[PDB]
Write a protein that binds this DNA or RNA. Structure first.
Ligand SMILES: [Mg+2]
Ligand SMILES: [Mg+2]
Ligand SMILES: [Mg+2]
Ligand SMILES: [Mg+2]
Ligand SMILES: [Mg+2]
Ligand SMILES: [Mg+2]
Ligand SMILES: [Mg+2]
Ligand SMILES: [Mg+2]
Ligand SMILES: [Mg+2]
Ligand SMILES: [Mg+2]
Ligand SMILES: [Mg+2]
Ligand SMILES: [Mg+2]
Ligand SMILES: [Mg+2]
Ligand SMILES: [Mg+2]
Ligand SMILES: [Mg+2]
Ligand SMILES: [Mg+2]
Ligand SMILES: [Mg+2]
Ligand SMILES: [Mg+2]
Ligand SMILES: [Mg+2]
Ligand SMILES: [Mg+2]
Ligand SMILES: [Mg+2]
Ligand SMILES: [Mg+2]
Ligand SMILES: [Mg+2]
Ligand SMILES: [Mg+2]
Ligand SMILES: [Mg+2]
Ligand SMILES: [Mg+2]
Ligand SMILES: [Mg+2]
Ligand SMILES: [Mg+2]
Ligand SMILES: [Mg+2]
Ligand SMILES: [Mg+2]
Ligand SMILES: [Mg+2]
Ligand SMILES: [Mg+2]
Ligand SMILES: [Mg+2]
Ligand SMILES: [Mg+2]
Ligand SMILES: [Mg+2]
Ligand SMILES: [Mg+2]
Ligand SMILES: [Mg+2]
Ligand SMILES: [Mg+2]
Ligand SMILES: [Mg+2]
Ligand SMILES: [Mg+2]
Ligand SMILES: [Mg+2]
Ligand SMILES: [Mg+2]
Ligand SMILES: [Mg+2]
Ligand SMILES: [Mg+2]
Ligand SMILES: [Mg+2]
Ligand SMILES: [Mg+2]
Ligand SMILES: [Mg+2]
Ligand SMILES: [Mg+2]
Ligand SMILES: [Mg+2]
Ligand SMILES: [Mg+2]
Ligand SMILES: [Mg+2]
Lengths: 49, 106, 127, 197, 172
RNA sequence: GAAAUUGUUGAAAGGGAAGGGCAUUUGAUCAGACA
RNA sequence: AGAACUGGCGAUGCGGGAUGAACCGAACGUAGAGUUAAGGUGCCGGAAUACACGCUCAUCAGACACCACAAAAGGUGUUAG
RNA sequence: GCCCUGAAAAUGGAUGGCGCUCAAGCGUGUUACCUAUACUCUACCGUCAGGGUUGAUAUGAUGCCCUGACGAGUAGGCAGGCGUGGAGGUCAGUGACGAAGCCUAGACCGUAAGGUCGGGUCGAACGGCCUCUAGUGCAGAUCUUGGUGGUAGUAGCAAAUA
RNA sequence: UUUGCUCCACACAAUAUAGAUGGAUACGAAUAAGGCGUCCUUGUGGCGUCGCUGAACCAUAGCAGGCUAGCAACGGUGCACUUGGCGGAAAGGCCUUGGGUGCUUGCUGGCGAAUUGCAAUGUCAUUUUGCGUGGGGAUAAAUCAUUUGUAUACGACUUAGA
């Protein structure tokens, strides 16, 4: 009929589905842009918290 | 030679039909190289074989045939209507079909 | 060796089953006419089962003929069988379902003697 | 007429190309279509962009995952024009569609195979001069297609190899003509002229 | 209404004892056949005279053929017609090779530009324009200039097979 | 010693029901008629 | 909501109008061959991506009776008068 | 005239859909072509009608034979038939060498109601024809009585200290 | 778990098939412009020529294509080898060398074909699998149970164990 009072929805539709991940090791979906003028180097690193 | 063909290549298009009722009794045939009813008048009467295979041998063969005849032309673009000894199975819309040169009148 | 006859044409070999006799066990296939006010079958909408009607009736000429072209005549004994003595091109004996095996071999023998066809000779046959 | 027909989409008008492609499959002719990125649609770019956004808003309100799917690639905009011209929920229809393949660019097999065109859907033959029109690849990038650049790069590479090929060939048929002409005027050739050859 | 013939039609009101030999009137009429032609005749006589078909008679009906059917002529054409909201007189000019051809393209034109079906039109006059320069409408004047020539750019040939192995050329 | 309903065996079909109509392919099955 | 005359639906399937009681065509025994209606013939879909003269370009074009809506007013868009 | 403005509503979305721009749009013209249980011709069914035919020595006179037209249908009327329990007659009917009943994507006759056969199971009785008779035909009635499912190996089997 | 797996070869058996029956025959780009030839001052160049459809081009004769001889060419092509190189968009294919070998209808010869009876697809393709045989080749893992708690309603997850 129309809310009554307006309020923001709860939580963020851009983090759905709220399922368990396919792996403990989260994936790197993107790497820094490449600049082939600099020396060769890793662009990330593993460790344990 | 490499070619031994004595028939014209053809194609089982459709049953005769209206917008929502077909008629398994009359098939519509597209003949290669025939683009008009005047052309298709040549083939009226010619005999037509749909040739197919089966797993189970019969009187010697694993190859069976359904025989028919072209009967009239159909529309303006060379398509032809044909009837068969038994109506064609309808999985064959789009299947190849053989149109012979007999009965000949040349 | 039956009388010559025009090719037998059957018009509707498919059985007329009652509507919805395929939908509920409580409904036998025996033909039964819809009388409902709304029924699609009674109203003959395109796509439902057709119904028996007099158009389907067979040629007076080949009606009742079996494939052999003989009418079948039910027979209980040699006397019944012998009613077909003068009509072996026209009628064929069927031996009735409740005739004993030993009486069948008599009936069958006499049929052979008279040239009368028998539609079910192998019945109860001591093989 | 041939087992498989390869159509150079470039310069064809979507729905007229689709209309013929659909019929062919239904009739049993396998079709493969290349360079769908160089397809056209009549109507200026903005128009067809607006149309595409209309399409884009239709979705299943309770779950957009079940709702109409919006493919952004020129090959697949194309398939869509096509698929909707085919009774595609019937066996006969699935069968026709399996007979079809569509590509952006000209990937292997088909780059060394001849491609044809379909004059009754050729833009330059159909559209009245001056009427604006759209190119499929440019429409697609604007609604998300990610691969115009990569296709462009491969195509330029492919187009260089094919220029070589052509050149070699044209060199060769020049020789062949030089041959065919010593034989001109010979007796067997005058006889063939006599018979229309 | 079709492919037109042009007819002379002649009628009169029926004779009477006190008035035998009534006057006799003629119309030229453009129609596809003599049945429509006699119909049209009665239609116009009744807009002009105390008569109708039940008290009149067709005296003669004859097709008039063009005198010089392979001679290009400049036609002046005068029409009355109804629109959706009124009725209107019009002058047009048509260049063709017969009155009959000329009137076909008129109905075509009237249907295309003004959306006038056949019922809504009255041809008032069709006349050959003898001197160029009494030619008034420029879409024709245009075709009277000396030593006139023009190309037909962007040639489009009809394909006869659905596939083609070239890539056409609109040269000409 | 029926039916509903059930177990096993055998055969078949099954991309959001099933079942039905006209037609034919394919499999299985079967009457008749030849002399 | 209520009358008039006829024709229909109700009691009626069939072809068309995608769909639909009433509109269009046409009224039904079982079948073969033929030809049509109303309606269609790019593809879906049987059937000319037929012929012919114009008109129309829409950053919410338009697309067929019943029928699934649009008006006053206004345009130096374009057309013919 | 066509187009444009004027032109605002609620899930995403409909010239039927795809899509179409010298159209696959709008107005008009000309051919061809597709297809209704309709029209034309033919066979077969039935209905109504009009004819013909008692002459024995063979078989249906309610018969046989020729001919023409016609066929939609609720409520409803009438007609000719199918099936069930009992009754009179008849077939000197069937049957322990297997009656009745039951089973059977085996056969055959009938437009259909239904009828007939084979095979399996079974165990004592039963059927054709003329006729008599009625407690004589089911899908329904929130029908009656009995039986049985999916629900489902599911809800649950957790108060009172162990 | 009674000798298993894999690639190549041939063999028998199956099973199939959305539909072989001479060839899918490769620039790009423009369309109010281009292709090809040719020259040159190498250019938005000169000159010539073509289109008006693939109605083309290529292939195509021989028991469905048998057995044989020769000549002229030195060409063509099938096959298995071998040399050098290319192609990653889905390359999985293209090109090149060299010897061998078959066919050659480029031409000229010898022999064969019937009775499949006046037609009957008259059977010539390519799918997947199964079983033995013998030429190479190769000799694991996953799951239950146990265990961790970075995980968990149950499955699942994540650890650990010769
Ligand atoms: Mg609010
Ligand atoms: Mg998972
Ligand atoms: Mg309908
Ligand atoms: Mg009932
Ligand atoms: Mg009702
Ligand atoms: Mg929105
Ligand atoms: Mg017991
Ligand atoms: Mg069935
Ligand atoms: Mg069937
Ligand atoms: Mg009522
Ligand atoms: Mg009606
Ligand atoms: Mg569709
Ligand atoms: Mg069609
Ligand atoms: Mg109106
Ligand atoms: Mg509508
Ligand atoms: Mg204006
Ligand atoms: Mg619309
Ligand atoms: Mg449409
Ligand atoms: Mg029009
Ligand atoms: Mg035509
Ligand atoms: Mg009929
Ligand atoms: Mg009749
Ligand atoms: Mg009736
Ligand atoms: Mg009775
Ligand atoms: Mg009784
Ligand atoms: Mg009683
Ligand atoms: Mg018994
Ligand atoms: Mg059963
Ligand atoms: Mg029998
Ligand atoms: Mg028994
Ligand atoms: Mg006892
Ligand atoms: Mg009685
Ligand atoms: Mg009672
Ligand atoms: Mg009942
Ligand atoms: Mg009951
Ligand atoms: Mg009930
Ligand atoms: Mg009832
Ligand atoms: Mg009950
Ligand atoms: Mg109960
Ligand atoms: Mg339990
Ligand atoms: Mg529980
Ligand atoms: Mg509790
Ligand atoms: Mg298949
Ligand atoms: Mg040039
Ligand atoms: Mg050059
Ligand atoms: Mg030059
Ligand atoms: Mg060529
Ligand atoms: Mg050879
Ligand atoms: Mg020889
Ligand atoms: Mg590929
Ligand atoms: Mg081995």
């Amino acid at each position: 009929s129309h809310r009554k009072y307006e309020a923001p929805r709860h939580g963020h539709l851009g983090f759905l589905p709220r399922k368990r991940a396919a792996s403990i090791r989260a994936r790197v979906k993107a790497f820094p842009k490449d600049d082939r003028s600099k020396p060769v180097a890793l662009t990330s690193f593993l460790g344990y918290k | 030679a490499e070619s031994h063909r004595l028939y014209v290549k053809g194609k089982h298009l459709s049953y005769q039909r209206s917008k929502r009722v077909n008629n398994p009794n009359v098939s519509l045939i597209k003949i290669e190289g025939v683009a008009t009813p005047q052309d298709a008048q040549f083939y009226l009467g010619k005999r037509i074989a749909y040739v197919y295979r089966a797993s189970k041998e019969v009187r010697g063969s694993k190859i069976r045939v359904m025989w028919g005849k072209v009967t009239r032309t159909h529309g303006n673009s060379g398509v032809v209507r044909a009837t068969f000894r038994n109506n064609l199975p309808a999985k064959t819309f789009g299947a190849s079909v053989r149109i012979f040169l007999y009965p000949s009148n040349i | 060796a039956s009388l010559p006859h025009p090719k037998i044409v059957k018009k509707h070999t498919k059985k007329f089953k009652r509507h919805h006799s395929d939908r509920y066990h409580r409904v036998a296939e025996n033909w039964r006419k819809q009388k409902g006010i709304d029924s699609v079958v009674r109203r003959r909408f395109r796509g439902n089962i057709s119904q028996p009607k007099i158009g389907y009736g067979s040629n007076k000429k080949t009606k009742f003929l079996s494939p052999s072209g003989h009418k079948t005549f039910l027979v209980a004994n040699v006397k019944d069988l012998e009613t077909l003595t003068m009509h072996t091109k026209t009628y064929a004996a069927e031996i009735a379902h409740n005739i004993s095996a030993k009486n069948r071999v008599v009936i069958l023998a006499r049929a052979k003697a008279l040239g009368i066809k028998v539609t079910n000779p192998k019945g109860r046959l001591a093989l | 007429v041939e087992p498989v027909v390869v159509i150079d989409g470039k310069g064809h008008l979507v729905g007229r190309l689709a209309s013929v492609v659909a019929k062919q499959l239904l009739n049993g002719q396998k079709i493969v279509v290349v360079r769908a990125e160089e397809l056209n649609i009549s109507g200026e770019f903005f128009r067809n962009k607006l149309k595409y956004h209309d399409f884009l808003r239709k979705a299943t309100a309770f779950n957009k995952t079940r709702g109409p799917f919006h493919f952004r690639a020129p090959s697949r905009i194309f398939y869509k024009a096509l698929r909707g011209m085919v009774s595609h929920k019937t066996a006969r229809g699935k069968a026709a569609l399996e007979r079809l393949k569509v590509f952006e660019g000209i990937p292997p097999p088909y780059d060394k195979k001849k491609r044809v065109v379909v004059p009754q859907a050729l833009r330059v033959l159909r559209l009245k001069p001056g009427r604006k029109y759209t190119t499929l690849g440019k429409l697609s990038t604007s609604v998300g297609w990610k691969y115009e650049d990569v296709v462009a790069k491969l195509e330029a590479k492919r187009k260089v190899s094919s220029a070589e090929y052509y050149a070699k060939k044209r060199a060769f048929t020049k020789k062949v003509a030089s041959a065919n002409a010593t034989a001109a005027e010979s007796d067997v050739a005058k006889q063939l002229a006599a018979l229309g050859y | 209404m079709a492919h037109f013939k042009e007819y002379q039609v002649i009628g009169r009101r029926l004779p009477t004892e006190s008035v035998p030999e009534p006057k006799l009137f003629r119309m030229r009429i453009f129609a596809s056949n003599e049945v429509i032609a006699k119909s049209r005749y009665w239609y116009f006589l009744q807009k002009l005279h105390k008569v109708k078909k039940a008290s009149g008679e067709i005296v003669s009906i004859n097709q008039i053929n063009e005198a010089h059917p392979t001679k290009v002529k400049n036609f002046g054409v005068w029409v009355r017609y109804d629109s959706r909201s009124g009725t209107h007189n019009m002058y047009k000019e048509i260049r063709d090779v017969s009155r009959v051809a000329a009137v076909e393209t008129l109905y075509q034109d009237m249907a295309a530009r003004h959306r006038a079906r056949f019922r809504s039109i009255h041809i008032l006059k069709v006349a050959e324009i003898e001197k160029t320069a009494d030619v008034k409408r420029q879409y024709v004047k245009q075709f009277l200039t000396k030593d006139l020539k023009f190309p037909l750019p962007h040639r489009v040939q009809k394909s006869t097979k659905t596939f083609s192995y070239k890539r056409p050329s609109t040269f000409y």
